[PDB]
Design a protein around this ligand. Structure first.
Ligand code: W7T
Ligand code: W7T
Ligand code: W7T
Lengths: 300, 237
């Protein structure tokens, strides 16, 4: 169990750690989060009480270094940093655990909500979507645009998700126009899975990361990516059976976790109605259609 | 974007453009089986691809053999249309290729877009005009070449005959759409109007009769009357 200490909390802020959120008052004696599950990526995220504009946060894996948060009064945000001095970091964190200045990550999770949301998500793949090679952790916020958004403007601050475009030469083999547009199996299996992602685990990892950035930061380009990656599978007549079964589990937990009041903006009516009721895979997502019908029948 | 009455004169500017109408591509006679069920039998069809500035008509004849053994023919017909339009564009010298293709039905947009991916600079546009190009098969010489075809064939016509020697393309298109709207609303009456006077003939190399300017005004007035009548006979007015 690892720890993300805080130098202080100089400004009032709602801090979230994975699916949990808590309020910290201005200059409250707060020195961080302990008992964090080793073996998962994690996200620590922020919404200032003064300016709800810009949700922002950091993806990290405590196996890769000792990370901490300190507020920067010039840039006006809570920044993640790496402390290279291990002996010292452990000594300071100990002092902090002794004074009970750190809040505790809950340990029970019957749901296994976070494992199930991050099953295929790896830090190394996050760091290729979010390029800042000098840090071991990755910053994301509500405003960052995607590479595909930028083709339709600062490249360093972009989300480099894999571009998916159903009316593109990459998607459509010359001479198979009707075939490839109405059945996207070529594009899913040959172009994306065999060619770009290499395997379905990496595909699902990016799909899960895009969803989590949409949910936690309201990142619109990430929501577009999540839906595009769903639609590409559902619109393929030929999908490995293990992938369909796993997709149903992935989406079920995403829909389960999504706040009910964010469905209007984070769920695309067209994609979901096509995927559940019209697509090749309309009958292959039993668990996802069941929670969608129970929680969100209005959208459908 | 969409083409409508506001940007209507754009049709007659000097940017090459084509209308594509697919409503006569997939045609059938629909009959009873010995068991009393209903069945269809496809008949020859055509793609109507028209340059509205010059009158040039690229009439691609769709022979019934292209449907043999195929399923979901109404959907296939949209993709076949788009395949043949793309093939036509590729066959034209670069300086004759269109800058825009306007489809008369919105279901042709995605099939044409996908088939024209190689031509990113050609715009594919819908229209909000309700153009009467379906009535092209009421023109006798066009119907005859379609029904006599024994194999896929492209035939080139000028749908304005020689009118552009005496009128502008805006006026020629307005005459054509009036004629076709009349043929679509009451084909028998429109054909009576066009041929009542046996002294006025259709040249061998033309589609329509050889009317003087004055006779065209009379004809056009008779077509307007027909359309308005039928619209009364229809709605009771
Ligand atoms: N907001 C989800 C609440 N989940 C808890 O069980 C309490 C929070 C957990 C993080 C530490 C602060 C209290
Ligand atoms: N700026 C160089 C020194 N910076 C720190 O001493 C940060 C500490 C690191 C352990 C966690 C609490 C704060
Ligand atoms: N009204 C049909 C049943 N729908 C609900 O009772 C809402 C709940 C919300 C949490 C998930 C299960 C559904």
């Amino acid at each position: 169990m690892n720890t993300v200490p805080f130098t202080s909390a100089p400004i009032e802020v709602t801090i979230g750690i994975d699916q949990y959120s808590f309020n910290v008052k201005e200059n409250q004696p707060f020195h961080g989060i302990k008992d964090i599950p080793i073996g998962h990526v994690h996200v620590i995220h922020f919404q200032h009480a003064d300016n709800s504009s810009m949700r922002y946060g950091y993806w990290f894996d405590c196996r890769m270094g000792n990370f901490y948060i300190q507020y920067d009064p010039k840039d006006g945000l809570y920044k993640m940093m790496e402390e290279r001095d291990g002996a010292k970091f452990e000594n300071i964190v100990h002092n902090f655990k002794e004074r009970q200045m750190m809040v505790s990550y809950p340990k029970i999770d019957e749901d296994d909500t976070w494992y199930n949301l991050t099953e295929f998500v790896q830090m190394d793949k996050i760091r290729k979507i979010v390029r800042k090679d000098e840090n071991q952790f990755s910053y994301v916020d509500s405003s960052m645009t995607t590479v595909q958004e930028n083709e339709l403007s600062d490249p360093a601050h972009s989300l480099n998700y894999t571009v998916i475009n159903f009316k593109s030469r990459e998607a459509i083999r010359p001479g198979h126009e009707m075939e490839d547009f109405l059945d996207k199996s070529y594009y899913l299996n040959t172009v994306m899975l065999q060619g770009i992602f290499k395997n379905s685990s990496n595909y699902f990892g990016e799909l899960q990361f895009a969803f989590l950035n949409a949910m936690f930061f309201g990142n619109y380009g990430s929501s577009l990516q999540w839906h595009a990656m769903i639609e590409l599978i559902c619109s393929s007549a030929t999908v490995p059976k293990h992938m369909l079964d796993k997709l149903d589990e992935i989406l079920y937990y995403q829909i389960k976790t999504l706040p009910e009041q964010y469905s209007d903006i984070l769920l695309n009516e067209r994609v979901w109605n096509i995927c559940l009721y019209s697509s090749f895979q309309k009958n292959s997502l039993h668990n996802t259609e069941k929670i969608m019908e129970n929680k969100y029948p209005e959208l459908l | 974007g969409a083409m409508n009455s506001s940007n209507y004169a754009e049709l007659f500017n000097n940017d090459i453009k084509l209308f594509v109408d697919d409503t006569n591509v997939y045609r059938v006679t629909v009959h009873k089986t010995f068991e009393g069920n209903v069945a269809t039998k496809a008949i020859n069809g055509c793609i109507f691809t028209l340059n509205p500035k010059t009158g040039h008509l690229f009439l691609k004849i769709i022979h019934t053999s292209v449907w043999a053994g195929q399923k979901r023919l109404s959907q296939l017909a949209k993709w076949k249309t788009a395949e043949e339009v793309s093939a036509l564009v590729r066959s034209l010298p670069k300086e004759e290729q269109p800058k825009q293709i306007i489809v008369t039905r919105k279901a042709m947009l995605d099939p044409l877009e996908v088939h024209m991916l190689d031509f990113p600079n050609i715009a594919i546009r819908p229209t909000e005009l309700r153009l009467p190009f379906s009535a092209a098969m009421s023109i006798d010489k066009l119907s005859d070449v379609v029904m006599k075809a024994t194999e896929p064939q492209m035939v080139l016509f000028n749908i304005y005959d020689d009118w552009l020697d005496r009128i502008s393309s805006y006026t020629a298109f307005s005459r054509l759409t009036l004629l076709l709207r009349a043929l679509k609303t009451n084909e028998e009456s429109a054909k009576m109007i066009l041929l009542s006077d046996p002294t006025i003939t259709i040249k061998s190399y033309h589609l329509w009769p050889s009317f003087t300017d004055e006779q065209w005004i009379t004809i056009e007035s008779q077509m307007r009357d027909l359309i308005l009548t039928e619209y009364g006979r229809k709605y009771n007015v």
